[PDB]
Structure formats: C-alpha cells, structure tokens
C-alpha cells in the first residue's frame, strides 16, 4: 500500500540518513538542520509504501509574502520513479498551501542540475527571469552566495 | 545616527559577507541561505549607525506551533556590546512576534558555545530539559545531526 503523512521531530534521523543514500553515494553540500522538522511540520510530507520511506519533502508558507509557498528540499527513493513519487510530494504539498491561502509555489537549483530543471518544467513550474542566461535558461546571479547561481521556479496553483 | 529596519532580499550579500569578517575565524558551515532573506523579512532586522550595519537578527514565527518564535541566528559588530545592540535587535524582535500572537521565544546553540549561553541567559532564557548533560547544561543529544548536540533556550514573552 501507499500513505502520506506530515513529518515529526522524532523524523530526523531517518530522514537525514537518506542525504548519504539516495544521492549515489556523493556527499551533498546542502544540509536539513532540525529547525525545519520542528517549525514547519504542517507542509513537510514523508511517504512511504508497507512501512518503508519511499520519498520526504520539506517546505513553509513564505511568511513576508503569504501568497507563496516555498519547496524547500524533496528526495525519492532510488527504486522508485522520480516522477510518481515526487508528483505525489508535490500534489500533497500544493493542496495543503492553497488551504493556507497560497495562490503560487517557488523553489530554486543549480543551471547545471538538469534533473531538477526537466523536473520541475514537467510539473508545471515556470522560471522567473533573472539577471543572467545559462545554457538558455534564465539565472540569478550569485543568488546563494559568490558562484552560486540560481534558477528559481515559480507555479501558480 | 541609528536605525533599526527589516531586511530585504537585496541584503543578503552585505550581511552574509560583513558577517564573516565579524567572526574572523576559518571557514564557517553554511547557516544563512538565502531563503531566510526572502521569506521571513518582517521578523528579521538589521541594526546600523551612519549608514554601516551594526547588527542583525533572522528569526520566524512557528509555522507547526504558532505561539512560538524562533531566533535563527543573530550578531552584534565585535566593536560593539552585546547586550546594546543584541538586547535592541531582540526587543524590537519580541515586540513584533508578539503582535503575531507568539507567547514564547526559541532558539539554539552548542553546549561549547559560553559567549551564546551567557548573552542569552542574560536576556532571561531558560534552558530546556535535554537528553543529556555538557558541562552542566541539559543538552538535546544529535539535536542537529551526529555529533551536533544542542542547548535549547525558551523564553516567555
């Protein structure tokens, strides 16, 4: 079977586990301190098939612009389809945010994550238009820090 | 003169590089996405006197537990006092969460860190009852991952 449910403090520990387990054994910079699975419970999901996590996502309802909702950091399983699981994520995520008055979801990656890029264009996600262009996608320049150029993704819902 | 003001996303390179001359030590783990300066600008200030930044403070309402404010990282310009700068950052902090309906005020820091301990013990912070115990403070063991113990402070407000 298949179930969704809102993540709890006791979740860290498996979910941060999988940061070194489902990315093919490479070390990710980008880490989840325990703020997130204590102050935004409500819109972060963890779901699972017979018991067993098959996918996380964390995200918030943007607190100065309350019209948005932010997707903060999502992971499926390896066995399982990115695009099944991840939409599933994201479907949850979506209709939990418009309960809470959201009319738009934002999230950013990396010009050269092409996973990330193809994913979020599958899902609906337009890209916001920056200061710069990357392979033909529009880019903010430096948005995380020197080097760190950011698409950022923006879906009405 | 002085000012205290919300911040606004374009801050994010002054105060992420002022804040690593301030430390003036190696290389620090990065804690200040730029996420922080986005979505939570009414509950996070920047302090200056004759247009250079004094201080700063990035802090939210709890989304999953709404009577509860989260201070996620503060600093006060080493050639300033702490309780001056630091004690007006989270006073004019506290008044703007308690117009949220916020009653009480969290945040975290490791057990090692006395200058932390101390300035917000000065500032009234109790400390929660942990797992364990770091020179005689309760601690919340792996609180934020392997090895990550944490102190976590609680105020009524």
Same mark, same amino acid.
């Given at each position: 079977?298949?179930?969704?449910?809102?993540?709890?403090?006791?979740? /860290?520990? @498996? #979910?941060?586990?999988?940061?070194?387990?489902?990315?093919?054994?490479?070390? !990710?910079?980008?880490?989840?301190?325990?703020?997130?699975?204590?102050?935004?419970?409500?819109?972060? &999901? =963890?779901?699972?098939?017979?018991?067993?996590?098959?996918? &996380?996502? %964390?995200?918030?309802?943007?607190?100065?612009?309350?019209?948005?909702?932010? =997707?903060?950091?999502?992971?499926?399983?390896?066995?399982?389809? +990115? @695009?099944? %699981?991840?939409?599933? !994520?994201?479907?949850? &995520? =979506?209709?939990?945010?418009?309960?809470?008055?959201?009319?738009? #979801?934002?999230? #950013?990656?990396?010009?050269?994550?092409?996973?990330? %890029?193809? /994913?979020?264009? +599958?899902?609906?996600?337009? =890209?916001?238009?920056?200061?710069?262009?990357?392979?033909?996608?529009? #880019?903010?320049?430096?948005?995380?820090?020197?080097?760190?150029?950011?698409?950022?993704?923006?879906?009405?819902?």
């Amino acid at each position: 079977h298949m179930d969704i449910r809102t993540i709890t403090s006791s979740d /860290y520990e @498996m #979910v941060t586990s999988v940061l070194n387990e489902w990315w093919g054994g490479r070390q !990710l910079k980008e880490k989840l301190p325990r703020l997130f699975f204590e102050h935004f419970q409500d819109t972060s &999901f =963890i779901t699972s098939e017979h018991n067993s996590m098959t996918g &996380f996502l %964390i995200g918030f309802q943007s607190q100065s612009d309350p019209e948005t909702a932010y =997707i903060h950091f999502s992971g499926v399983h390896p066995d399982f389809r +990115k @695009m099944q %699981i991840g939409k599933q !994520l994201y479907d949850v &995520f =979506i209709e939990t945010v418009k309960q809470r008055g959201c009319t738009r #979801v934002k999230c #950013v990656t990396s010009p050269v994550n092409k996973v990330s %890029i193809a /994913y979020h264009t +599958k899902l609906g996600f337009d =890209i916001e238009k920056g200061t710069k262009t990357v392979n033909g996608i529009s #880019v903010f320049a430096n948005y995380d820090g020197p080097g760190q150029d950011r698409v950022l993704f923006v879906k009405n819902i």
